[PDB]
Coordinates of C-alpha atoms and ligand atoms in Angstrom, one line a residue:
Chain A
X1 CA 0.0 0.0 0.0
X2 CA 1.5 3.2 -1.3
X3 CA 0.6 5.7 1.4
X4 CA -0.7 9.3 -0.6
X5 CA -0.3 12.4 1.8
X6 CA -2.4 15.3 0.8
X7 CA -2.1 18.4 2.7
X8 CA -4.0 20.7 3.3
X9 CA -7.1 19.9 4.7
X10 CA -9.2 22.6 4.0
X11 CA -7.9 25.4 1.7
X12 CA -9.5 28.7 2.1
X13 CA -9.7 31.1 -0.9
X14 CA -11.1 34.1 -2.4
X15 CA -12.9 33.8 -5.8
X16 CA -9.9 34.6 -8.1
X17 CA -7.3 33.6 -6.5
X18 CA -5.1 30.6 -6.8
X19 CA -5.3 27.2 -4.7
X20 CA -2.2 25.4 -5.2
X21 CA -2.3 21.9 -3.4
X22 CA 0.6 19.3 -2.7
X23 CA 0.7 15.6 -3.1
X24 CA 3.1 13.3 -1.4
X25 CA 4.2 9.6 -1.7
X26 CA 5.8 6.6 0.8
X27 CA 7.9 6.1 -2.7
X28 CA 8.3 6.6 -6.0
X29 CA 5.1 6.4 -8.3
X30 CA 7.2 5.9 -11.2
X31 CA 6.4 2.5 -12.9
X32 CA 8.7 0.7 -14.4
X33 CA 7.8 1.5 -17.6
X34 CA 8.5 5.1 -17.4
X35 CA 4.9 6.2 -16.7
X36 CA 3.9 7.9 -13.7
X37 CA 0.3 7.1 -12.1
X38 CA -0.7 10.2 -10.2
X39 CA -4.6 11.0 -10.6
X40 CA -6.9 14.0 -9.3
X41 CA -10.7 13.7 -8.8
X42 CA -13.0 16.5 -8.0
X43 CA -16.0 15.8 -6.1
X44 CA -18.3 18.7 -5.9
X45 CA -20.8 18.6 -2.5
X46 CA -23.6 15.9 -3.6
X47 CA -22.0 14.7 -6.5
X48 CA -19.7 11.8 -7.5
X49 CA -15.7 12.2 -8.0
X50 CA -14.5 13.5 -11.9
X51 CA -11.1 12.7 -13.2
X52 CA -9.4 16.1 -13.6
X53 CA -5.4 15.2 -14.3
X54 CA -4.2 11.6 -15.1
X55 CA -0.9 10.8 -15.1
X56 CA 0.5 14.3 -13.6
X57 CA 0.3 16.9 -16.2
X58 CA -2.4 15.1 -18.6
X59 CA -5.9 16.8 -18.1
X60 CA -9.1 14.5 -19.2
X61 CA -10.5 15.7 -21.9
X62 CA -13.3 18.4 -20.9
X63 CA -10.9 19.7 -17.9
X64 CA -10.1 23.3 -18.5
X65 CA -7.2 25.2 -18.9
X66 CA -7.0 26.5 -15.3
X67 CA -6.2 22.9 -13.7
X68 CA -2.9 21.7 -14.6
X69 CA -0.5 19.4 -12.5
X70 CA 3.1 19.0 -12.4
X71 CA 5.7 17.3 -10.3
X72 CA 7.7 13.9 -10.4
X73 CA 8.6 11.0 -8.2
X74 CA 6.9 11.3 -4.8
X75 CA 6.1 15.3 -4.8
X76 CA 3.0 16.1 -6.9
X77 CA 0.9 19.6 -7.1
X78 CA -2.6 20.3 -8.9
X79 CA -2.4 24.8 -8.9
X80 CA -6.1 26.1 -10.1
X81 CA -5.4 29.6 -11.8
X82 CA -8.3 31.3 -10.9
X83 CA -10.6 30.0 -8.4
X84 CA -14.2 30.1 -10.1
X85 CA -17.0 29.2 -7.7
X86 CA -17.0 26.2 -9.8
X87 CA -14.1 24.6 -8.3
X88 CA -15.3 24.3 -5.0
X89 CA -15.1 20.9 -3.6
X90 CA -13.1 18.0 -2.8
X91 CA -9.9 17.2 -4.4
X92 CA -8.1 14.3 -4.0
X93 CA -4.9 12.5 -5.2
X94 CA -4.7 8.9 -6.2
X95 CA -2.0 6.5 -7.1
X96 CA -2.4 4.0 -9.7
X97 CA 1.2 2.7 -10.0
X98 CA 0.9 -0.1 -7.5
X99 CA -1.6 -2.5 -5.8
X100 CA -3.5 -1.4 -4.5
X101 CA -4.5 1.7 -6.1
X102 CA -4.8 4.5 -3.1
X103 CA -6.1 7.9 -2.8
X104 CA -4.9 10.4 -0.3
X105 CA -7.0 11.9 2.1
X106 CA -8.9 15.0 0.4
X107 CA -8.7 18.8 0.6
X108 CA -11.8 21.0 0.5
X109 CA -12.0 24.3 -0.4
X110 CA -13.9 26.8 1.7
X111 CA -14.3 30.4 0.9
X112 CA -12.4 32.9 3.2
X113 CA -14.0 36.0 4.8
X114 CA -13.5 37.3 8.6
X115 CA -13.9 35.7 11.8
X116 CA -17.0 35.2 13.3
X117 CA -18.1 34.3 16.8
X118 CA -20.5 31.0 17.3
X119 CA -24.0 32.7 18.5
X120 CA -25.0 29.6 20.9
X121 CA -28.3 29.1 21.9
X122 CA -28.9 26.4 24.8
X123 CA -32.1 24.9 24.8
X124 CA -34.1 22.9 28.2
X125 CA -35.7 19.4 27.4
X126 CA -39.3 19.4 25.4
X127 CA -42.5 18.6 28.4
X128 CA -43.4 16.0 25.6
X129 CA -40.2 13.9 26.1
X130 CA -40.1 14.2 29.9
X131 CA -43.8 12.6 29.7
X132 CA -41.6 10.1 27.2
X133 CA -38.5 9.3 29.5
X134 CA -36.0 11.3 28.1
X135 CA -34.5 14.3 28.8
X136 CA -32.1 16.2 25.6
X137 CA -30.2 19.4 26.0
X138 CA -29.6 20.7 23.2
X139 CA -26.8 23.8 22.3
X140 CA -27.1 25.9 18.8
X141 CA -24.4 27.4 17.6
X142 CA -24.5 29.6 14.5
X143 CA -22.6 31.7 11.8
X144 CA -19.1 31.5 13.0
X145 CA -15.7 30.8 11.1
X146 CA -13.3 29.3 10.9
X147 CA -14.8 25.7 11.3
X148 CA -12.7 25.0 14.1
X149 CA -14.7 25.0 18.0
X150 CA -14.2 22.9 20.8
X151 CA -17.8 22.7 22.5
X152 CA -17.7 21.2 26.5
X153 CA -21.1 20.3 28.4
X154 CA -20.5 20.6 32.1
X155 CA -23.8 19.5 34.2
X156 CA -22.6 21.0 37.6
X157 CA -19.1 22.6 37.0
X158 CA -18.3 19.1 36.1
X159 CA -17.6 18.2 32.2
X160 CA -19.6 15.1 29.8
X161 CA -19.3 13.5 26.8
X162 CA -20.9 10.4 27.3
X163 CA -24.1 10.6 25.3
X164 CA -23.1 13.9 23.0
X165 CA -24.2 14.0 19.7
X166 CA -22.7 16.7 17.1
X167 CA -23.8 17.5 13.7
X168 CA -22.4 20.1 11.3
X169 CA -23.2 22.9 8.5
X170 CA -21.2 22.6 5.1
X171 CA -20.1 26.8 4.3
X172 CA -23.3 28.8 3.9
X173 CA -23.4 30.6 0.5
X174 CA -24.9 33.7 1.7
X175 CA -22.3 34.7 4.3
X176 CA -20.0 31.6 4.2
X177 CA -20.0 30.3 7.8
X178 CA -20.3 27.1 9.9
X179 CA -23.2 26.3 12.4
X180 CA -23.1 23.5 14.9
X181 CA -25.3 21.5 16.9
X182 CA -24.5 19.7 20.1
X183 CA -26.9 17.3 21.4
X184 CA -26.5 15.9 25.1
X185 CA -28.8 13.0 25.5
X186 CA -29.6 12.1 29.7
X187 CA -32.5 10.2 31.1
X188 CA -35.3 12.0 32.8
X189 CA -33.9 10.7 36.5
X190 CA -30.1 12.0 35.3
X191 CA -31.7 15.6 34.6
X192 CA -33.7 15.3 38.0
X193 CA -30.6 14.1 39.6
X194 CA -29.1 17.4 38.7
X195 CA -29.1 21.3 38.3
X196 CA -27.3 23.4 36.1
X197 CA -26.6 22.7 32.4
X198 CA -23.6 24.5 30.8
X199 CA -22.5 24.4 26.9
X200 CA -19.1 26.7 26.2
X201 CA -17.5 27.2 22.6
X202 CA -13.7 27.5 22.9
X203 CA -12.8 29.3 19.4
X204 CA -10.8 32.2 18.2
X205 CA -13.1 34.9 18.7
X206 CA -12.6 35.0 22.6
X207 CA -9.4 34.0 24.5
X208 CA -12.2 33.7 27.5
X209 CA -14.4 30.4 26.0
X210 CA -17.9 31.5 24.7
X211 CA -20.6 30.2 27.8
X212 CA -24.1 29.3 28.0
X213 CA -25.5 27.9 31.0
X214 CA -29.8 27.2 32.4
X215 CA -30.2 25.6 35.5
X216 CA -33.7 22.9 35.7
Chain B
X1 CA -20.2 6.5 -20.7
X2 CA -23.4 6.0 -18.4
X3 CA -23.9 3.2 -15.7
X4 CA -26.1 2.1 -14.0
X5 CA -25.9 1.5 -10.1
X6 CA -28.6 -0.1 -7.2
X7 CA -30.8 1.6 -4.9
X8 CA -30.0 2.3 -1.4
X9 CA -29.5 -0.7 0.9
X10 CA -30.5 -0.6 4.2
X11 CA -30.0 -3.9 6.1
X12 CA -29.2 -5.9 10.2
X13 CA -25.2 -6.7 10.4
X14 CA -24.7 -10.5 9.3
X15 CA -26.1 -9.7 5.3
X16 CA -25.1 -10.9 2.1
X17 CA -25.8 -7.2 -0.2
X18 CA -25.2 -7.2 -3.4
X19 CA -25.0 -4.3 -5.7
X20 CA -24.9 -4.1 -9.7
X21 CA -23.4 -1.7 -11.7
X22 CA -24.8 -2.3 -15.7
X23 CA -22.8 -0.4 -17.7
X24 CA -24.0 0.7 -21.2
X25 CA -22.0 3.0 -22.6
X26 CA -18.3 1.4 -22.8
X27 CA -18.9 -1.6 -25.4
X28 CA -16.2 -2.7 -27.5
X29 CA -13.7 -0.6 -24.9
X30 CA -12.5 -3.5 -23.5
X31 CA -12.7 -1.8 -20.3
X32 CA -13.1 -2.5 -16.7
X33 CA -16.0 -1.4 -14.3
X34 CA -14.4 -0.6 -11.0
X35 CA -15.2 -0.6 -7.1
X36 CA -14.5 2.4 -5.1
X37 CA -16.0 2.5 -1.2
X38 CA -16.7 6.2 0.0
X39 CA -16.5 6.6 3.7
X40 CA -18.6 8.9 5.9
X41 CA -17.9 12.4 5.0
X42 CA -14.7 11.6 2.6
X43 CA -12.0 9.1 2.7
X44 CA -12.0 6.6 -0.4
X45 CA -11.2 2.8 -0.3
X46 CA -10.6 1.0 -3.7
X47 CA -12.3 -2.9 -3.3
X48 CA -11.1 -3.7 -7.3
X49 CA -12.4 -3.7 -10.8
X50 CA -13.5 -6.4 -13.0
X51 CA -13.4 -6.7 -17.3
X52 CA -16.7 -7.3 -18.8
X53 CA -15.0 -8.4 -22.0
X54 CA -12.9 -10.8 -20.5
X55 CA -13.5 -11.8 -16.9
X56 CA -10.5 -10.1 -15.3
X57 CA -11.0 -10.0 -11.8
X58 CA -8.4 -8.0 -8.3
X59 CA -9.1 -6.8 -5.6
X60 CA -7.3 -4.6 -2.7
X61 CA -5.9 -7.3 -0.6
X62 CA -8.3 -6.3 2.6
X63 CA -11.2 -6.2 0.5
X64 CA -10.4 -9.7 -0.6
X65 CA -12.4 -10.9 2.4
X66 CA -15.8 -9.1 2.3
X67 CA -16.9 -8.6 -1.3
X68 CA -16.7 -10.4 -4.3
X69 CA -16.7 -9.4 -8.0
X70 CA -19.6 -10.6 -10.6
X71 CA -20.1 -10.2 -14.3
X72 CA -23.1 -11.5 -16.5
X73 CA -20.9 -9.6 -19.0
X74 CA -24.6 -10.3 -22.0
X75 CA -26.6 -8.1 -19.2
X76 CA -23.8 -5.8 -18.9
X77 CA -24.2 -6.2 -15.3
X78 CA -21.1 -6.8 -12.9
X79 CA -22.0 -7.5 -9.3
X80 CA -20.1 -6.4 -6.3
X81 CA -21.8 -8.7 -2.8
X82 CA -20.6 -7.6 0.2
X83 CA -21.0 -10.5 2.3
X84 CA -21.3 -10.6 6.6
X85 CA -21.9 -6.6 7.0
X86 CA -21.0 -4.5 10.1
X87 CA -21.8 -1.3 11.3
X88 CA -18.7 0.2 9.6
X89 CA -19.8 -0.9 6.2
X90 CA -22.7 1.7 5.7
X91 CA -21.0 3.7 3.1
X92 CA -21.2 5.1 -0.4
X93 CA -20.4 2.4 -3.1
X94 CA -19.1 3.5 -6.3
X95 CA -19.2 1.9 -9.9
X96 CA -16.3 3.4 -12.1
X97 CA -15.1 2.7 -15.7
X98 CA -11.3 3.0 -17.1
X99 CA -10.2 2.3 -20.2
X100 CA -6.7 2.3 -21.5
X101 CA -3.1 3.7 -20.6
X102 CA -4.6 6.6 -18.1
X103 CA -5.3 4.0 -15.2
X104 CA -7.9 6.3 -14.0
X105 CA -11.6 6.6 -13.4
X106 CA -12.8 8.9 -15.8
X107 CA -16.7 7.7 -15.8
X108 CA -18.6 7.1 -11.9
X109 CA -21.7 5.9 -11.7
X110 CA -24.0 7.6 -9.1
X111 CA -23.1 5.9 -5.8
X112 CA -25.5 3.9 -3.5
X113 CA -25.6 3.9 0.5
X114 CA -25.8 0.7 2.1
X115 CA -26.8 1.7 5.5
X116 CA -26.9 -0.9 8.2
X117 CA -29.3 -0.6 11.2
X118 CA -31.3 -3.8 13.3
X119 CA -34.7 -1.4 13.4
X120 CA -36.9 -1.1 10.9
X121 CA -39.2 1.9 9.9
X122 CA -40.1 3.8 13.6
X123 CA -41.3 6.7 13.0
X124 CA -39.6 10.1 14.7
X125 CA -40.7 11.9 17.6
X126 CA -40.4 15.4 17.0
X127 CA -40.5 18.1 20.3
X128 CA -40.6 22.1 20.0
X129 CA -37.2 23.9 21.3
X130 CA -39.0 27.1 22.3
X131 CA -36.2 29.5 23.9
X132 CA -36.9 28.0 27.5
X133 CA -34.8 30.5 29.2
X134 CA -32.0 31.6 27.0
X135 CA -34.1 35.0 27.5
X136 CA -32.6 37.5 24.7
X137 CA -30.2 38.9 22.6
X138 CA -32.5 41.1 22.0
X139 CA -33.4 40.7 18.5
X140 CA -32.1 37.3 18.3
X141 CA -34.5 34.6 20.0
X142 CA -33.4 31.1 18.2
X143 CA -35.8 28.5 18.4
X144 CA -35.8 24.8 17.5
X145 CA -37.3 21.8 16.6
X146 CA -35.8 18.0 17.8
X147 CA -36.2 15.4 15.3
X148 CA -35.2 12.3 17.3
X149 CA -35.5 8.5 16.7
X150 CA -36.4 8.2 13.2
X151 CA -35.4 5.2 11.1
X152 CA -34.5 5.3 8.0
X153 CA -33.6 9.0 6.7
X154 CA -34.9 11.5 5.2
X155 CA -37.0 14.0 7.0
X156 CA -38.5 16.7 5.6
X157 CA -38.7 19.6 8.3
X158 CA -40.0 22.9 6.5
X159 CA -41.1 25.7 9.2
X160 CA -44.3 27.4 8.8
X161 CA -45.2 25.2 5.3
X162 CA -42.5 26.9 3.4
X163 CA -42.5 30.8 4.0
X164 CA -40.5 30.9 6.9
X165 CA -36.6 30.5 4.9
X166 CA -34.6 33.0 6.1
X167 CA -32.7 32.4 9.1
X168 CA -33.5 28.5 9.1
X169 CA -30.0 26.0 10.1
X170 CA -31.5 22.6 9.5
X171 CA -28.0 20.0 10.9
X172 CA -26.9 16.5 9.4
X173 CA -29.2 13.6 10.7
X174 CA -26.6 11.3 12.8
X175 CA -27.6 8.3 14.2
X176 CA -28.3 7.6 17.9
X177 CA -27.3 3.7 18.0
X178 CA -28.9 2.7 15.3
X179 CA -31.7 5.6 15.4
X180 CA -31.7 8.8 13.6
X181 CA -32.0 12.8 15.4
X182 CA -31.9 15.9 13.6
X183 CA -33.0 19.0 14.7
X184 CA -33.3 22.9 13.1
X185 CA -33.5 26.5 13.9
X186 CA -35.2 29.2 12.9
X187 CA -34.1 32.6 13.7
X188 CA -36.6 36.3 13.8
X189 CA -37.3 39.3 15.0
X190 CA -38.1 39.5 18.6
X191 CA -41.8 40.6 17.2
X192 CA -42.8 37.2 14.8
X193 CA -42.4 34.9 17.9
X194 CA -44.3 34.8 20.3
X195 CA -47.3 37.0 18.3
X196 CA -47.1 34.6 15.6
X197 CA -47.3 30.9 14.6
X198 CA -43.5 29.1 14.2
X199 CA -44.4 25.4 13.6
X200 CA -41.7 23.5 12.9
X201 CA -43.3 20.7 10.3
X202 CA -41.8 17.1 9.9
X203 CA -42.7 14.5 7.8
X204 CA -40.7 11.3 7.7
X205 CA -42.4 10.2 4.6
X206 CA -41.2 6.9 4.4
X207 CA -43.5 5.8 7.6
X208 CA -46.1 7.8 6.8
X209 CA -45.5 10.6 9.6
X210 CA -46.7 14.0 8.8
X211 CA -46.7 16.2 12.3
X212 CA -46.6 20.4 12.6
X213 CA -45.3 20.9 16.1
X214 CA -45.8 24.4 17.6
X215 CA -43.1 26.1 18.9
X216 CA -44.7 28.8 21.2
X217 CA -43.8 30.4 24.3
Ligands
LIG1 O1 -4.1 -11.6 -19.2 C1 -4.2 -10.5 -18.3 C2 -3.1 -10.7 -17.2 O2 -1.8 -11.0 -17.8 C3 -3.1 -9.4 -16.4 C4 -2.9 -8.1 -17.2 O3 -3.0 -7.0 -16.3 C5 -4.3 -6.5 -15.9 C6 -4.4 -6.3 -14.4 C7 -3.4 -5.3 -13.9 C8 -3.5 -3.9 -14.5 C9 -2.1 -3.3 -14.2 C10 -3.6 -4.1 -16.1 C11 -4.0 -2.7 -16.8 C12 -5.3 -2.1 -16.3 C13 -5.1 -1.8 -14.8 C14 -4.7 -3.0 -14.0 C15 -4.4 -2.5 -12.6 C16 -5.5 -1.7 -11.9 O4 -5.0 -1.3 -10.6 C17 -6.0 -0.5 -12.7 C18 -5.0 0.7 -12.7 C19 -7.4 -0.2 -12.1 C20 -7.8 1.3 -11.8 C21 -7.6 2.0 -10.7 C22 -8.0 3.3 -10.9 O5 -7.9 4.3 -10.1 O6 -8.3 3.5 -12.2 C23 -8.3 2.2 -12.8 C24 -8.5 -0.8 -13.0 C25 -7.7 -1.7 -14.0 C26 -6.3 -1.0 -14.2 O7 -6.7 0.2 -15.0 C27 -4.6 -5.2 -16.6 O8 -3.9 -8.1 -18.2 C28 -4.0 -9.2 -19.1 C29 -5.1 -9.0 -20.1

């Protein structure tokens, strides 16, 4: 297995710009035969990969003129003149020179703009699902960026993660940030059994993490 | 090049699935249809390819354990069976062709999710996240609808039958054991709620599960 190492994971651009990306192998993809076996595969958000550059330089027919590849050996780059919106997704490297083919792990391509601090909202369990047995707390936590929080429940000063449940917001194309939900799941006697609820978003926005607390 | 792929296979670990890919497009290319695995979110695992014209037949060597390559090469259909199914295994599958020196995919078929859960169609329970005591930012009062124990996806959750768009956040459905949640929020003026209706809506369509739930005060 020929271990591909792209880097880096998310790419953040500006329509226009250009995204240069780096492709790395555990040896030489030179076959002997004199061919090299690099691929490159777009994969737009709810679509399949396309083939983009075979063989290193080589684009598929259909690929324009803004995509090209170069490199040799075991260092390999894909640069994208001008980044059309168009371009956005998933690119990732693969290796067709030995068995088994491999792929390297991906790099997505998120619009830039500023900061933005996570507005959290932290929300006490529904009187339906008490009557049901359950008890869910539940923390919102919109239009921020980067895509990078660190989000803590604490029921009493003391932390939790067993029963968390996380879920997460692609870039929004209106004013391209992230939104997060985080999901603690107790039973009706755990919530009775205790007080005060707290959700906090560590993130660069505050050095001081963002808090929300309720108490039942 | 088009092929043609299975529909999404939901089944209880310990199955045999089998998926087809029918290509009809590459005849005469004596091509090969290939296996690709997508994982959850990204990562890509090749399983191997197999020539129609032919019978030629690999596989990565860690695949070559749970599937197995088919061809009724006159139907133009070459079957992948992925055989004793874990958790793990609910993933994309991907059909690909390739034809000569590139030794890359240039033609995927459309993908199919074989999703693997021991529940069968339960119907979601859906509860109203009215701002119980977040109090205000002033303008800003978020409120939120909880989607929870659904089986299979999707969910259809619009707020106030359609008009209400703007300022909606509807997350990912993740599975709780085996279990789907879900939830949304909708985001107004500090006037809308509480004067005004903001019913969350849900219907999980393939249980037959229509339910508005308001979200008031
Ligand atoms: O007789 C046979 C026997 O001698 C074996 C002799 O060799 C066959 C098996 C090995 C091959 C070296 C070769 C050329 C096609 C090539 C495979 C290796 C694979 O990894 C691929 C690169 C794979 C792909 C991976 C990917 O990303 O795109 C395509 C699909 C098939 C593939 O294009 C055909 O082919 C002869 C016909």
């Amino acid at each position: 297995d020929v271990v591909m190492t792209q880097t880096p994971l998310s790419l953040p651009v500006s329509l226009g710009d250009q995204a240069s990306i780096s492709c790395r192998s555990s040896q030489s993809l030179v076959h002997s035969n004199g061919n090299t076996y690099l691929n490159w595969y777009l994969q737009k958000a709810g679509q399949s990969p396309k083939l983009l550059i075979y063989k290193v330089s080589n684009r598929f027919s259909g690929v324009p003129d803004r995509f090209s590849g170069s490199g040799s050996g075991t260092d390999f780059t894909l640069k994208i003149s001008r980044v059309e919106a168009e371009d956005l997704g998933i690119y990732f490297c693969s290796q067709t020179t030995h068995v088994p083919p491999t792929f390297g792990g991906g790099t997505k391509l998120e619009i830039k703009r500023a900061d933005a601090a996570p507005t959290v909202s932290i929300f006490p369990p529904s009187s339906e699902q008490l009557t049901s047995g359950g008890a869910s707390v539940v923390c919102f936590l919109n239009n921020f960026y980067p895509k990078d929080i660190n989000v803590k429940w604490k029921i009493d000063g003391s932390e939790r993660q067993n029963g968390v449940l996380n879920s997460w917001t692609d870039q929004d194309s209106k004013d391209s940030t992230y939104s997060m939900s985080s999901t603690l799941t107790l039973t009706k006697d755990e919530y009775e059994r205790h007080n005060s609820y707290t959700c906090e978003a560590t993130h660069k926005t505050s050095t001081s993490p963002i808090v929300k607390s309720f108490n039942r | 090049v088009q092929l043609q792929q299975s529909g999404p296979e939901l089944v209880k670990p310990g199955a045999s699935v089998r998926m087809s890919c029918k290509s009809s497009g590459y005849i005469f290319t004596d091509f090969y249809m290939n296996w690709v695995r997508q994982s959850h979110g990204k990562s890509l695992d090749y399983i191997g390819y197999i020539s129609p014209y032919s019978g030629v037949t690999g596989y990565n060597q860690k695949f070559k354990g749970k599937a197995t390559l088919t061809v009724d090469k006159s139907s133009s259909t070459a079957y992948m069976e992925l055989r004793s199914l874990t958790s793990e295994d609910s993933a994309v599958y991907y059909c690909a062709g390739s034809s000569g020196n590139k030794w890359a995919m240039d033609y995927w078929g459309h993908g199919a999710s074989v999703t693997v859960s021991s529940a069968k169609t339960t119907a979601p329970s859906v509860y109203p996240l009215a701002p119980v005591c977040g109090d205000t930012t002033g303008s800003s009062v978020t409120l939120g609808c909880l989607v929870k124990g659904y089986f299979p996806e999707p969910v259809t959750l619009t707020w106030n039958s359609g008009s209400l768009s703007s300022g909606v956040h509807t997350f990912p459905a993740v599975l709780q054991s085996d279990l789907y949640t879900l939830s949304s929020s909708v985001t107004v003026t500090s006037s809308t709620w509480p004067s005004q209706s903001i019913t969350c809506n849900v219907a999980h369509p393939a249980s037959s599960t229509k339910v508005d739930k308001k979200i008031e005060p």
